[PDB]
From a paper:
Briefly, we grew apo crystals of the [name] WD40 domain by using slightly modified previously published conditions and succeeded in solving the structure of cyclic peptide 18 bound to [name] to 2.18 Å resolution by soaking with a 2.5 mm solution of 18. The asymmetric unit contained two [name] monomers and the electron density was evident in both binding sites. Chain A showed strong ligand density and allowed us to model cyclic peptide 18 with full occupancy. The ligand density in chain B was weaker and refined at a lower occupancy (0.83). Overall, the binding mode of the constrained peptide is almost identical to that of the published acyclic peptide‐bound structure. The overall root‐mean‐square deviation (RMSD) between the two structures is 0.55 Å. The N‐terminal phenylalanine side chain of the constrained peptide occupies a similar position to that of the methionine side chain, with the aromatic side chain efficiently packing against the hydrophobic part of Glu 550; this potentially explains the slightly higher affinity of acyclic FWRPW, compared with that of the MWRPW peptide. The most significant difference between the cyclic peptide conformation and the bound SMRWPW conformation is the linker, which appears to cause a slight change in position of the N‐terminal tryptophan and could go some way to explain the lower affinity of 18 compared with that of the linear FWRPW peptide. The crystal structure of the constrained peptide bound to [name] suggests that the linker causes some strain in the molecule that may, at least partially, explain the lower affinity.
Transducin‐like enhancer (TLE) proteins are transcriptional co‐repressors that modulate key pathways for developmental and oncogenic signalling, such as the Notch and Wnt pathways. The TLE proteins do not bind directly to DNA to exert their repressive effect on gene transcription; instead, they utilise their WDR domains to bind to DNA‐bound transcription factors. Given that [name] does not bind to DNA directly, and that its repressive and potentially oncogenic role relies on the ability of the WDR domain to bind to transcription factors, blocking of this interaction has been suggested as a possible treatment for cancers with elevated [name] activity. Herein, the structure‐enabled design and synthesis of a constrained peptide inhibitor of [name] is reported.
Author numbering:
A (entry chain A): 435 to 451, 455 to 513, 519 to 559, 564 to 770
B (entry chain B): 435 to 450, 456 to 513, 518 to 559, 563 to 625, 628 to 770
The structure:
């Protein structure tokens, strides 16, 4: 059993309009659905840099993406291994379909493997040499892939056919999220921009320009907010429509992953600086911080918000139990 | 400017044991500090055993070896009060409500009464070889002194005469606080005793597993906080059987002081730590690590400042930030 203890830090969360520190409301650090802390419960010794992590629904299995393979762990040694691509190249993203019987694996290879849960059901073949990020539509019919050439590939998962290729981003598309169904696509890139896309009419809506590259992004499940993890080490929380934005300074290096909890009240960000930071939506009050042994490359939160899994540069994954 | 950031620790606050589930106003609320910022260092040069702050806040009084130093906190002392002799420590110094008088107690049979060039107005002479703690009545007429022999001497400050000597403890009386009808005293006999000030007799007795070094009575009533030799802080209800046991010290809890609003309190240890706690279940508000043992503490009447006395032969002034 653990108990809260209040700390303070020099001003790290600012309102941008020029910067002014955020005066936190009383429900910033404590409230229903607000975690008190995160407790490490497992270490998954993958043995390769873990670039992608996904948690099963219901929570039982953890999928870790390393060099050439996906390892499946029973969190109640791997229970199985999924060989997807050349054992010299990294898996960059693996997404489960809502039901949980299908897994889509992307990486440093031209093909996306669709696994039945195990064997390869099908293989979508792209023109691009690599996939850096994947997103599945809430309806489980479409898959969005962020290509190395900056394009966004739109796949029809039923017929295993390409439907379209968005304008993307120049130099590479690094991250993706779907808008609370499911008409807007948000992508980030190495061209210092975040772009929104009309999924019904098929093309670009908005463009947010930044001073550095975007490595991660998340769309708030209760809507309104988009959280952006940058090369600069800053996290920016922008309103989709309003001009108000927050700038968060608790990372000392690149913000590599970002994930909102399903209730939308809080989110996590992970850095090259060994930190997993939990933040209050939207002004970024610091809920908890966990320091790891190496760079934290990827993260996932279970659909019930009870567990967090992180992928590490120390060639492992860590499972945390979120304590309320 | 500073912003709050939530942290967690393995269970350190228990209901007497079961860990305390904190309510939402435990770590955040009006009158609950966010943090404490060091603003001054007072280089006394002797271990600072007693610290008291003027009302209104302007001057801080630090008690060391045969010397009280006066500091204007608005880095060098503005004045010095030499308590003869210079070889013994000042254990307690309490100002009278107005602020023009200072009662100095310590490792000597006499209590000096200073007029505020400052001079010694009078000297109350006790039979005991030392005074470990002082408390002044709200009316400014009586002074209670905790003697080394375990007795509680009651002094009439106007006539400089002893009125009575309470049974005290079977061993030394180390600490004291006024409820202004009930006196609470702690001792080296592992007990906390309450005294009827109107009838002049002993009301209650709380028995502990180790010696009591410090104690405080919550200004809004109900709670008594006890700092112990075991390193534990215990918060006992005056009437109910419920009690809290706090474990954030690794060594003797040497001083303890409630904020005047009664919502929070501080405790200091031989372990170099200053801890701020939520009344009554002891949620950890802030912690400050010092360079040496923290022997004494005071909080200003407005709850804006904390002063601590250190084993590193100095005092530190903190500004409490809300
Ligand atoms: N050692 C092989 N086979 N992979 C290495 C690929 C490394 C990866 N960089 C590309 O994807 C880059 N692409 C490549 O390097 C290609 N050789 C991949 C490829 C191999 C084989 C076939 C086809 C393709 C493109 C890229 C460039 N940047 C990107 C940002 C996000 C997403 C993608 C990029 C700009 C900033 C790069 C810093 C960053 C970063 O900070 N990396 C971290 C974490 C990290 C450590 N090891 C990793 C392995 C894979 C992915 C990430 C990491 C670090 O070094 O601390 C950011 C996250 C990914 N990353 C990389 O350096
Ligand atoms: N050298 C001269 N002139 N003063 C020194 C007096 C030292 C003092 N000890 C008595 O009061 C003792 N009385 C005495 O020894 C002399 N007057 C004779 C009586 C005593 C004994 N104990 C007490 C607890 C509370 C109040 C009084 C006492 C129990 C064990 C001691 C713990 C404690 C403790 O742990 N103190 C720390 C911190 C400290 C360092 N120097 C100090 C001077 C005064 C008060 C505290 C300190 C320590 O000695 O390491 C607690 C605060 C006082 N203290 C002492 O050791």
């Amino acid at each position: 059993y653990f108990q809260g203890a209040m700390g303070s830090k020099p001003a790290y969360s600012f309102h941008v309009t020029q910067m002014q520190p955020v005066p936190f409301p009383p429900d910033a650090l404590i409230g229903p659905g607000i975690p008190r802390h995160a407790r490490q419960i497992n270490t998954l010794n993958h043995g390769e840099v873990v670039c992608a992590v996904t948690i099963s629904n219901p929570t039982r299995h953890v999928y870790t993406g390393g060099k050439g393979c996906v390892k499946v762990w029973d969190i109640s040694s791997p229970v199985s291994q999924l060989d997807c691509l050349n054992r010299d190249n990294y898996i960059r993203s693996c997404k489960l379909l809502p039901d949980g019987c299908t897994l889509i694996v992307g990486g440093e290879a031209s093909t996306l493997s669709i696994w039945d849960l195990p064997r390869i059901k099908a293989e979508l073949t792209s023109s691009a040499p690599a996939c850096y990020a994947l997103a599945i539509s809430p309806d489980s019919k479409v898959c969005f892939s962020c290509c190395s050439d900056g394009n966004i590939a739109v796949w029809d998962l039923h017929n295993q056919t390409l439907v379209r290729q968005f304008q993307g981003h120049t130099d590479g598309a690094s991250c993706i999220d779907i808008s609370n169904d499911g008409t807007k696509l948000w992508t980030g890139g190495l061209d210092n921009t975040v772009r929104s896309w009309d999924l019904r009419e098929g093309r670009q809506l908005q463009q947010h320009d930044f001073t550095s590259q975007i490595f991660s992004l998340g769309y708030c499940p209760t809507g309104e907010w988009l959280a952006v993890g940058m090369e600069s080490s800053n996290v920016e929380v922008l309103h989709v429509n309003k001009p108000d934005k927050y700038q968060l300074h608790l990372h000392e290096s690149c913000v590599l992953s970002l994930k909102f909890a399903y209730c939308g009240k809080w989110f996590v960000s992970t850095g090259k600086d060994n930190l997993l930071n939990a933040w209050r939506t939207p002004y970024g009050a610091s809920i908890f911080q966990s320091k790891e042994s190496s760079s934290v490359l990827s993260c996932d939160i279970s659909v019930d918000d009870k567990y967090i899994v992180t992928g590490s540069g120390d060639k492992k994954a860590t499972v945390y139990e979120v304590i309320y």
